[PDB]
Paper text:
ComEA, a DNA-binding protein widely conserved in transformable bacteria, is required for this uptake step. Following this contact with the tpilus, the movement of tDNA into the periplasm is driven by its interaction with the widely conserved periplasmic protein ComEA. A ComEABs contains an N-terminal transmembrane region, a previously unidentified OD, and a C-terminal DNA-binding domain. We show that this domain drives ComEA oligomerization, and that oligomerization is required for genetic transformation.
In contrast to ComEABs, in the ComEAGs structure there was interpretable electron density corresponding not only to the OD (amino acids 62–124) but also to one DNA-binding domain (amino acids 143–207) per asymmetric unit, which contained two OD protomers again arranged head-to-tail. Because there is no interpretable electron density corresponding to the ComEAGs linker region (amino acids 125–142) of either protomer, it is unknown which of the OD monomers in the asymmetric unit OD dimer connects to the single modeled DNA-binding domain. In fact, we could model the DNA-binding domain in the ComEAGs structure only because it made fortuitous crystal contacts. Similarly, in the ComEAGs structure, examination of symmetry mates reveals that the two-membered asymmetric unit uses the OD multimerization interface to form a kinked-ring spiral along the crystallographic screw axis, containing 12 head-to-tail protomers per turn. A slight tilt between ComEAGs protomers has minimal effects on the ComEA inter-dimer bonds, but it causes ComEAGs to form a kinked-ring rather than a closed ring within the crystals. ComEA oligomerization interface amino acids are conserved and mediate conspicuous intermolecular interactions between the OD domains of ComEA protomers, e.g., the side chains of ComEAGs Arg85 and Asp113 (corresponding to ComEABs Arg83 and Asp111) which form intermolecular salt bridges. The ComEAGs X-ray crystal structure revealed not only the structure of the OD, but the three-dimensional shape of the ComEA DNA-binding domain. As predicted from sequence analysis and noted previously, the ComEA DNA-binding domain structure contains two helix-hairpin-helix (HhH) motifs. At an intermediate concentration of 31.3 μM we observed both monomer and dimer, and were able to fit the sedimentation velocity data to a discrete monomer-dimer equilibrium model, resulting in a Kd of 33.8 μM (95% confidence intervals: 19.3 μM, 48.4 μM).
Residue numbers in the entry:
A (entry chain B): 62 to 124, 143 to 207
B (entry chain A): 62 to 124
The structure:
């Protein structure tokens, strides 16, 4: 009636814990100390039951799926919503002319990326 | 009672190790110096039971 689970990912104390088979993913994460500041509880089923030998992975915002605007290529840049050849090549032109981007809001200074455009792009970015 | 396993992949010291049959993959990988900075931790279950002649391959990120 006991389960051994590998609680890893964006949890405070990742390890191999021992809990009751009637426990649920939330309990195992609670025992592990909660979520780190980079976790994404969106993609975790906190209600799912625990079984022995189970692996509980908590991914981080991204996941991987983040394009580093400062060090991306035209092919990688235009992989995001809206950004195409000319919009991707202006973000790269601004990269090389007026320097790299400090924050996500620096994209607003690029021609073609307005407030509407930036909103459908924020969660897929990685601005050093 | 005894289980011999081959720990390969993104571990500090891959190779053959001996473990108790009642052990988990956590123990086998602890004997090899644990994972490395390039191990795809999402591809390794340390709560898994170990059996004799078992091969434990830890893939890298990007494989």
């Amino acid at each position: 009636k006991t389960a051994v689970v590998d609680v890893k990912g964006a949890v405070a104390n990742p390890g191999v814990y021992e809990v009751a088979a009637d426990a649920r993913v939330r309990d195992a994460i609670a025992l592990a100390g909660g979520l780190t500041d980079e976790a994404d509880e969106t993609k975790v089923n906190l209600a799912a039951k625990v079984h022995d030998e189970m692996m509980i992975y908590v991914p981080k915002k991204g996941e991987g799926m983040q394009v580093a605007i400062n060090t991306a290529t035209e092919e990688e840049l235009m992989q995001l919503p809206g950004i195409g050849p000319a919009k991707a090549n202006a973000i790269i032109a601004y990269r090389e002319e007026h320097g790299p981007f400090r924050r996500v809001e620096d994209l607003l200074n690029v021609t073609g990326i307005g407030e509407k455009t930036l909103e459908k792009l924020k969660p897929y970015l990685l601005v050093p």
